[PDB]
Structure formats: C-alpha cells, structure tokens
Amino acid sequence: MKVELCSFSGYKIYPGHGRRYARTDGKVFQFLNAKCESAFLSKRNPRQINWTVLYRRKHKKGQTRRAVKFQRAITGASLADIMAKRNQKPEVRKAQREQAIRAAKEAKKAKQASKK
Amino acid sequence: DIPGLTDTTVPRRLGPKRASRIRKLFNLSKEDDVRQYVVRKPLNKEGKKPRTKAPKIQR
Amino acid sequence: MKLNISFPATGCQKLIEVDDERKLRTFYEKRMATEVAADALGEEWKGYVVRISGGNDKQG
Amino acid sequence: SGAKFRISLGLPVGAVINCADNTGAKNLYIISVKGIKGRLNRLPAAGVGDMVMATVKKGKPELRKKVHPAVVIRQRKSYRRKDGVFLYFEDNAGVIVNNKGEMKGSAITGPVAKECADLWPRIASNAGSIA
RNA sequence: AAUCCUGCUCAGUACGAGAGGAACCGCAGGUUCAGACAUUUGGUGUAUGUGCUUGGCUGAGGAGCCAAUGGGGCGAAGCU
RNA sequence: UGGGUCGGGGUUUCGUACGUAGCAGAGCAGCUCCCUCGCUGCGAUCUAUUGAAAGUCAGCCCUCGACACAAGGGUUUGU
RNA sequence: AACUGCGAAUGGCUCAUUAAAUCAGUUAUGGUUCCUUUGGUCGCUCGCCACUUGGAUAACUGUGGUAAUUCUAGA
Ligand SMILES: [K+]
Ligand SMILES: [K+]
Ligand SMILES: [K+]
Ligand SMILES: [K+]
Ligand SMILES: [K+]
Ligand SMILES: [K+]
Ligand SMILES: [Mg+2]
Ligand SMILES: [Mg+2]
Ligand SMILES: [Mg+2]
Ligand SMILES: [Mg+2]
Ligand SMILES: [Mg+2]
Ligand SMILES: [Mg+2]
Ligand SMILES: [Mg+2]
Ligand SMILES: [Mg+2]
Ligand SMILES: [Mg+2]
Numbered sequence: 001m002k003v004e005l006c007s008f009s010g011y012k013i014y015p016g017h018g019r020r021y022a023r024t025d026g027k028v029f030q031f032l033n034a035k036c037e038s039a040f041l042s043k044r045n046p047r048q049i050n051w052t053v054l055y056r057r058k059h060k061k062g063q064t065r066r067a068v069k070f071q072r073a074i075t076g077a078s079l080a081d082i083m084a085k086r087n088q089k090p091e092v093r094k095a096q097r098e099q100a101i102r103a104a105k106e107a108k109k110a111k112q113a114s115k116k
Numbered sequence: 117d118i119p120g121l122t123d124t125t126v127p128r129r130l131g132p133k134r135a136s137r138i139r140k141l142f143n144l145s146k147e148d149d150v151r152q153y154v155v156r157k158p159l160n161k162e163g164k165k166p167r168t169k170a171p172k173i174q175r
Numbered sequence: 176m177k178l179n180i181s182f183p184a185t186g187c188q189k190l191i192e193v194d195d196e197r198k199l200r201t202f203y204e205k206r207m208a209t210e211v212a213a214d215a216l217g218e219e220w221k222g223y224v225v226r227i228s229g230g231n232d233k234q235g
Numbered sequence: 236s237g238a239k240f241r242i243s244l245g246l247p248v249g250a251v252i253n254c255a256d257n258t259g260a261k262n263l264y265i266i267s268v269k270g271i272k273g274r275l276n277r278l279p280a281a282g283v284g285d286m287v288m289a290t291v292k293k294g295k296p297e298l299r300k301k302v303h304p305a306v307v308i309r310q311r312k313s314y315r316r317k318d319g320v321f322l323y324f325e326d327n328a329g330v331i332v333n334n335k336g337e338m339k340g341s342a343i344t345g346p347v348a349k350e351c352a353d354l355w356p357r358i359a360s361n362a363g364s365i366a
Numbered sequence: 367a368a369u370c371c372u373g374c375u376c377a378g379u380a381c382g383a384g385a386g387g388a389a390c391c392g393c394a395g396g397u398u399c400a401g402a403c404a405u406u407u408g409g410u411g412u413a414u415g416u417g418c419u420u421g422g423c424u425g426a427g428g429a430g431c432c433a434a435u436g437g438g439g440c441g442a443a444g445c446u
Numbered sequence: 447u448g449g450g451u452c453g454g455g456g457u458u459u460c461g462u463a464c465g466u467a468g469c470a471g472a473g474c475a476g477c478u479c480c481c482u483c484g485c486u487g488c489g490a491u492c493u494a495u496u497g498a499a500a501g502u503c504a505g506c507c508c509u510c511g512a513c514a515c516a517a518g519g520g521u522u523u524g525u
Numbered sequence: 526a527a528c529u530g531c532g533a534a535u536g537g538c539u540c541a542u543u544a545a546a547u548c549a550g551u552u553a554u555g556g557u558u559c560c561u562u563u564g565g566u567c568g569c570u571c572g573c574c575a576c577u578u579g580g581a582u583a584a585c586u587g588u589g590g591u592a593a594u595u596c597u598a599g600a
Contacts, residue, residue, distance in 0.1 A: 076131065118219065136577090243408095
C-alpha cells in the first residue's frame, strides 16, 4: 500500500520489487527487473521494444458537431424587452420604418429652407 | 436549480455595438430606425441626477 | 481541493470546496475539454454533465 | 532518536571515490573507516553516511599529501532501505569534513543519500537534492 | 554460545571557581560470532530456454547442424 | 479407487514465428499500340496478421479429457 | 484603463578583443537592401451586402490558484 511506481517499461512496480537508480544529474529511475534495467542502461529506446507500454500505445496495439446560443438580458433591457422589440416583426417594424421617413421628410422640407 | 448558482441570472454587461450585431440580435431588416433600437444603458448614481447613456454604433 | 463551477447560460460562477476523494475521482484521469457528469456530489448535482475547462496546480 | 540501519557497504579500503564538494579535490582514496573493529583479513568497508579517513590523490596540492576525514554521500553498491527499495547511484562520491562533522567545502554536486543526510545535518543543508 | 560498541534520554544535570563533565533505569541501533533461509536484490546458468550474430555445411526458402559450451543479450528452476 | 503417460489450462522466459499481403522501402533493371502517370522484376529493412512463435518439471501449479496399467513378484521372521 | 500605430536598433558608457584586421584618404555597387521625408502612382485590368460583410479579443463585471513575480485560468 506504498506509493505505486512505474518502470522503464511502463509496468507497475509493487513494493519490494526491482531497484531504484539515482543518477548524478539528479534524476531518479525505478526498474521492475534487471531486464528493464539493462535495457535502460544500454540506452535502448522503449518505443522500439515491442513488449513495452510506450511501444504499445505508440503503435496503438489493442486500443460530432455542437453549438448553442442562448438569449440573455443585457444591462438596460430584460429578456422581455428584447423579445418584444424583436417581436415587432409582423409589420409593426415596417410601421416604425415608414413613420421615420416621413418624420425626416418634413424635416427635409425644413432643411431645404435651411440648406437654401 | 442549484442554490445560488442556477438563479439570479446576471445580464450581459452591455449590448451590441456594430450596426450588424444589433440587427442580428433584434431582427432588423434595413433602415428600420436602427439607431433607436440600440440598447440604452441607464446610469443611476446617488450624488447625481438619473440619466441614460447610449453608445456610439460603428459601421 | 476547490472546484470552480460556472454556468454560461446564467453566469453566477461560484466556488465549491470538497475534501472527499470519491466525488472528485470521477473527474480524475480526465483531460481538458471533456464532458463529465457530476452525479457524484450528493443528490443535488444530478442530471448534470460538466466540462473540464481548466485548473491550477498545488503551486498555482 | 533513531540510529542508522545496516546497509550494504561496497567501498572497501583502497577505493578511490569522487569528491563532490568544491574544496578543489577531485578524488578521495579511502584509507580506513571509522568505528570498524574488524576481523582477520577483512577489509574495513564503508557505505553511504559512513565517516572515513581519506587522502586525495588528484586535486589541489595543499590538500594532497594529508589525511582528511570524509563522509560517503553516494555509493554504487545497491542497498536496501527497510521499505523494500534497492537503491544505488551512478557513482561513489564523498565529501571532505572535519572530525566535528562540518563540511570543509560549501556546495555539493549531485544528490546525497538520505541516510547520509539525517546522519549529517551539515551535509544535508548543502545537498542540492536528496535520494 | 553468544560478544562488544555507539547514539538518544537521564543531562550542560551530579561534581567543579571555572574549564569541563558522568552514572543507574529506559529507548533505538550497530560490531564480532553463531544457526538458518531465498520473499526480495545480487551472482551462477549447457533448462543448451528464447532472440541476435561470424565462418562453414545440408542445391535455395523454411528448418537446422558443426566450430572440444562458436560468440554474445536476456533468462525459469535450483544453488548461493 | 490409485498412481502414471500424453493432452489441456495456469505460471513464467524470451521477444513479435513461417507464410501471405502492402501505392512501406535507399534505389536499380526491363515494357511503353499499352500507360497520360503506369506496370513487371531485384532489393537489406519496415508494417499487419502477431505481447506473436517457441519452451516451461525433468524436483513448477490445477486437471478429471484420452490411453494403458494396477490383489503382482522374491527372501525371511515365533513368546 | 485597454486594444491599435509608432519608438524602444538613437543616445550614454567602456576600450577587452582586434596588427591590411580596425581606421584614414580614394573609388565602385553597370554586384544590393532601405522605416521615414519629398515628389510621382492609386476608374490604365472589360471580370439578393456595396447605402458598408464576417468572427474573436481587450479594457470591464464575476470566481479563484500560488510563499512569491510586471504569473495568470475558467466564465
Ligand atoms: K580495526
Ligand atoms: K544462449
Ligand atoms: K539472474
Ligand atoms: K536465480
Ligand atoms: K511475420
Ligand atoms: K507483432
Ligand atoms: Mg467608424
Ligand atoms: Mg592477512
Ligand atoms: Mg566457548
Ligand atoms: Mg552462419
Ligand atoms: Mg535460411
Ligand atoms: Mg562434420
Ligand atoms: Mg575440431
Ligand atoms: Mg546474465
Ligand atoms: Mg503442461
């Protein structure tokens, strides 16, 4: 029930098994047995050794579209306000565009007297 | 509802600014009084009169 | 271990403090941007699948 | 308190180990081990955390033709650590100390065995890492 | 047929002007020796077990063999 | 019922078998009504089949599968 | 405040290196690059948004981590 370690081969080293290797540069390694240890010492790469966990996941041995947008209240207008504004669609919107044109048309007639 | 989490929804601090991002939010077609439909944020400070503040709309 | 929970639809993010490993271990061994169901905590976090968006190390 | 448990020695008299401190010495030739009563024909041997008498063979001339107290901090012989782990290092290394236990140098290159640390607090403070 | 030593505590205590400086009980360990043992780590290794490899040989492939254990890596069990 | 002998399973050792396939492969050699970018060979090695193949009690573990064999032999012993 | 653009390659210090090297005078780039400034050029092309298109991100609100930094994450 001690800390569970992992080897050069990626295997799981139970307590009382293998050896631990402390290099001069400060890195510490643990090997499950002398086979994994000798492979590590001879500088063999575990990605090229077939029975190694690193090799197996490297070669993968054995192993949609979404989006949503939600309406929110925006400071100065509750969700009710925006819905009512965007529900002016059934010609209420068209009613508002056309009164602005005539509300600027008579101003244009005043502007004609102001321009000229 | 999770207590204190799925309630008292916080509003987006401030609405759209580009003249097209307001049209998509409010289904503006074309020249339907685009200026007025922009959200006008009200400001309420105790040591001052109440007043609402509108932003400059781009494009 | 603290959990930062945020619901984009309603904002109102809030911090959850847990000292139980089992409620947390549903999250353990998962990467970011993976959606996990938080049915581990009590009877109130039910029908809730949640996405891991980030975190911080013991050292920050 | 707590005394040091027995460990595999692996460094007999006549072993030349590296000097891991900045004293200017490069190697240390073990001439004897402290606390060794011994036995006919048996070489006094030392492990990590053991205080030894050594003479530096190569290094700086003012350190050479003298006998220095030294403490082994790294060993290449595997040794068991009461919890099942057999630990060994890349080299045999030691540091030069006085009879009181204070390291003559100021810094240690490389790790220091845990047994040598808690047995010698002066060496432990100067240790960059502990294995 | 067991042996001796060290560290902690007693204790900067007794004692002493001071410098210095113990002991009994207790605890944790070591030395020498003794009797075993192989779970672990190490050694051995002709299981002639399994890969690699040189020269030659069976027409080639495959499968093998010879070179007084061809050489070498890893290695069960057993011994240690 | 027994213990054997095979087989099987387990364990374990080594490290991925032969064959087949690949538009993998340094390149090289032939065929161009052909092909409009190809096909036919040689080629160490690579990939997949394939943690495969092989061994494993002879002093490893469990079998209840198969086969035969096991109330047989000889020499002695008395208050 | 922040995004953006520009500057930060100037100035200042020192003289360690360096002996056809540096540097000085002379000459070439018909053997090259060049922010900026100034002046040219900007309908020279036949070919359901143009009355103006798309998405994010800052600053900002809110939840934190870290012993610590002009560190930063999620929303
Ligand atoms: K002695
Ligand atoms: K062999
Ligand atoms: K071995
Ligand atoms: K063995
Ligand atoms: K094959
Ligand atoms: K394979
Ligand atoms: Mg503009
Ligand atoms: Mg002798
Ligand atoms: Mg006697
Ligand atoms: Mg051969
Ligand atoms: Mg062959
Ligand atoms: Mg012959
Ligand atoms: Mg011969
Ligand atoms: Mg071997
Ligand atoms: Mg079998």
